[PDB]
């Protein structure tokens, strides 16, 4: 459905003069993960506050979930939901109604109308300069899965094995994650915006729409180019 | 929608007297419509406006480093933001569009209003003078005042009460800082 | 040229 990137549309890693570590931390071992939770508070008309305690490191007590519009916030306002996605700490501001906190965009799927007995595996096809490089499987325990959840799991493997994001830069020039669903398709830019600084909130903002895809009909492919 | 509404307002006013010579910072804490707590650079400390603003003033006056930051804010915040926007806020100059036309279709010997439409200008400082065949006319000057459009432009309608005889020349003089010489638009009866 | 903002203070509790 969405057209493929233009010859100059993709972000180049060579143009980025900052630190790739700020991008790597989002797709590292740490992420917000909660099973069957309801929103305790609300900061603004487009967001929701969930009480999720960090047990792995202990960096957060409350998580802010932002959306593109007011309609998305009122939809998951009372219903018991499943939270998954990459979180940021810098430039994350909100106040709970009467201490350590984190912020994120979308990544919410209803608990009642979902969940699976067996872990569904989705095949990933990684391409280096249009040519096949490697292939791996991504596991999930839900039918309707957010685009953020699948994007995080795919990047986490590529950071650990193929080393997608390093401390200073990346071994690949351009990169984009493609999600194909029967006739409809959509893509997200993997590389950061050009400059000396990387904004975590501005980049993670692409998940505010809360795009969901069915695990049974979803196909995922990664396209990256060398320097 | 019958549910009640609650509003909290915070305003940081930077008052500039004679350019930059005298700077006054005014912090204002407003609940609904009534102002509770305020700070003034001329005072140097937080002073309560209402009874609800009393514990906030005492809490903020106890800490010497909060007050020091607010006192230094006339230079680090007020004087700083003035110089940043100086090229597009203070020094903004837009030439006005002057148009002279009668209010209604009326023949000679009978009264009519001469509309001197002056629109799209910055700043608001303007001097509109009426002339009857070279001589200044101060009587019967109906002005709508200064209207702010919101898009950094101003508009004013200055009307003159006249009784055209035959071939009288009515000139509208417009004085604005954007123009070196005053703009004059003439209308013949 | 950067615009500077004033930090809001928390009320007494």
């Amino acid at each position: 459905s969405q057209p493929d990137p233009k010859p100059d549309e993709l972000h180049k890693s060579s143009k980025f003069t900052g630190l790739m570590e700020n991008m790597k931390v989002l797709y590292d071992d740490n992420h917000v993960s909660a099973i069957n939770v309801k929103s305790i508070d609300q900061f603004l008309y487009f967001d929701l506050i969930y009480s999720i305690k960090d047990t792995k490191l202990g960096n957060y007590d409350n998580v802010r979930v932002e959306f593109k519009n007011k309609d998305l916030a009122d939809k998951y306002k009372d219903k018991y939901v499943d939270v998954f996605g990459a979180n940021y700490y810098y430039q994350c501001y909100f106040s709970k109604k009467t201490k350590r906190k984190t912020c994120m965009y979308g990544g919410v799927t209803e608990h009642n109308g979902n969940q699976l007995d067996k872990y569904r595996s989705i095949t990933v096809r990684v391409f280096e300069d249009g040519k096949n490089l490697l292939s791996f499987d991504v596991q999930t325990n839900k039918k309707k899965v957010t685009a953020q959840e699948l994007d995080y799991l795919t990047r986490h493997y590529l950071v650990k094995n193929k080393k997608l994001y390093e401390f200073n830069n990346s071994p690949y020039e351009t990169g984009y994650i493609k999600f194909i669903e029967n006739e409809n398709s959509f893509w997200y830019d993997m590389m950061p915006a050009p400059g000396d600084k990387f904004d975590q909130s501005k980049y993670l903002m692409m998940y505010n729409d809360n795009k969901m895809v069915d695990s049974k009909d979803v196909k995922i492919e990664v396209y990256l180019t060398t320097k | 929608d019958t549910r009640p509404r609650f509003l909290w307002q915070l305003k940081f006013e930077c008052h500039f007297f004679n350019g930059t010579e005298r700077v006054r910072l005014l912090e204002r804490c407003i609940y609904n419509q009534e102002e509770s707590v305020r700070f003034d650079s001329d005072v140097g400390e937080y002073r309560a406006v209402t009874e609800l603003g009393r514990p906030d003033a005492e809490y903020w006056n106890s800490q010497k480093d909060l007050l020091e930051q607010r006192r230094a804010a006339v230079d680090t915040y007020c004087r700083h933001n003035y110089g940043v926007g100086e090229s597009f806020t203070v020094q903004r100059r837009v030439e006005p569009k002057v148009t002279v036309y009668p209010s209604k279709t009326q023949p000679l010997q009978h009264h009519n209003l001469l509309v001197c439409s002056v629109s799209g200008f910055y700043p608001g400082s303007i001097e509109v003078r009426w002339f009857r065949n070279g001589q200044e006319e101060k009587a019967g000057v109906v002005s709508t005042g200064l209207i702010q459009n919101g898009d950094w432009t101003f508009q004013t309608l200055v009307m003159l009460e006249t009784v055209p005889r035959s071939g009288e020349v009515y000139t509208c003089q417009v004085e604005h800082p954007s123009v070196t010489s005053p703009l004059t638009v003439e209308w013949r009866a | 040229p950067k615009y500077v903002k004033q930090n809001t203070l928390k009320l007494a509790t």
Partner: T-cell receptor, first 111, second 110 residues
Framework: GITQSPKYLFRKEGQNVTLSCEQNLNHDAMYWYRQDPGQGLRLIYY???????QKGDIAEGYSVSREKKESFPLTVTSAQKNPTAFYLCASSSRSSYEQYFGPGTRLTVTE | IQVEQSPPDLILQEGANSTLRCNFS?????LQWFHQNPWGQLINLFYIPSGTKQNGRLSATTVATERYSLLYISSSQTTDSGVYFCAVDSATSGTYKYIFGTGTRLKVLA
């Protein structure tokens, strides 16, 4: 307070060394500096909060980690031409804004 | 961005008074005053981006418009000996990017 372990470090040319820095002051901002004999403090890398990373003057050849709000270690790679320096870790207050320094670490690298 | 401390070296007697100056090329949001003891431990003296503060025998003043900072040491003690640093956070680029000065070498003669 702020802790820097060990007090003295020694490694040969080519080897990688990780310098530890810990604080229980609950500060978000953490810093890494290096001091040469008779010289001043040169900023390497700094973190404003957990998962945030910023560059400094002498950043090349070094790498930092920030997974938790307590620890911020500095790794010295073989890429650094002159690694022999007195490394100092710092932490800025959230409310007072005061920068507090640790004991420091003396590192010596020889071929 | 550019920090210059004057004097580079200062020799004082026990119980003497002297002022230490720190000059910076740009406008600063945050300023720090340090005292590095002969062993290398940096002792935080003052956080003074503007105004005047007092801490025992030591006093500090900063003028943001004039772009300089002063550090007054009354009744010099033998333990005050070492290097005095002036760290500044420039508004031109980056928040909390503290740049340290050349330093004032103090030798208090007992």
């Amino acid at each position: 307070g702020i802790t820097q372990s060990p007090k003295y470090l020694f490694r040969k040319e080519g080897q990688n060394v990780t310098l530890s820095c810990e604080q229980n002051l609950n500060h978000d901002a953490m810093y890494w500096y290096r001091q040469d004999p008779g010289q001043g403090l040169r900023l390497i890398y700094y973190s404003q909060i957990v998962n945030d990373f910023q560059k400094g003057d002498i950043a090349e050849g070094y790498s930092v980690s920030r997974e938790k709000k307590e620890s911020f270690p500095l790794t010295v790679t073989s890429a650094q031409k002159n690694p022999t320096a007195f490394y100092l870790c710092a932490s800025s207050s959230r409310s007072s804004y005061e920068q507090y320094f640790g004991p420091g670490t003396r590192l010596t690298v020889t071929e | 961005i550019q920090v210059e401390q004057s004097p580079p070296d200062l020799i004082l007697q026990e119980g003497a008074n002297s002022t230490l100056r720190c000059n910076f090329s740009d406008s600063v949001n945050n300023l720090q005053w340090f005292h590095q003891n002969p062993w290398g431990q940096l002792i935080n003296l003052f956080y003074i981006p503007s105004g005047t503060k007092q801490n025992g025998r030591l006093s500090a003043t900063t003028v943001a418009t004039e772009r300089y900072s002063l550090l007054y040491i009354s009744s010099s003690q033998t333990t005050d000996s070492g290097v005095y640093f002036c760290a500044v956070d420039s508004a031109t680029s980056g928040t909390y990017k503290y740049i340290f000065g050349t330093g004032t070498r103090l030798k208090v003669l007992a």
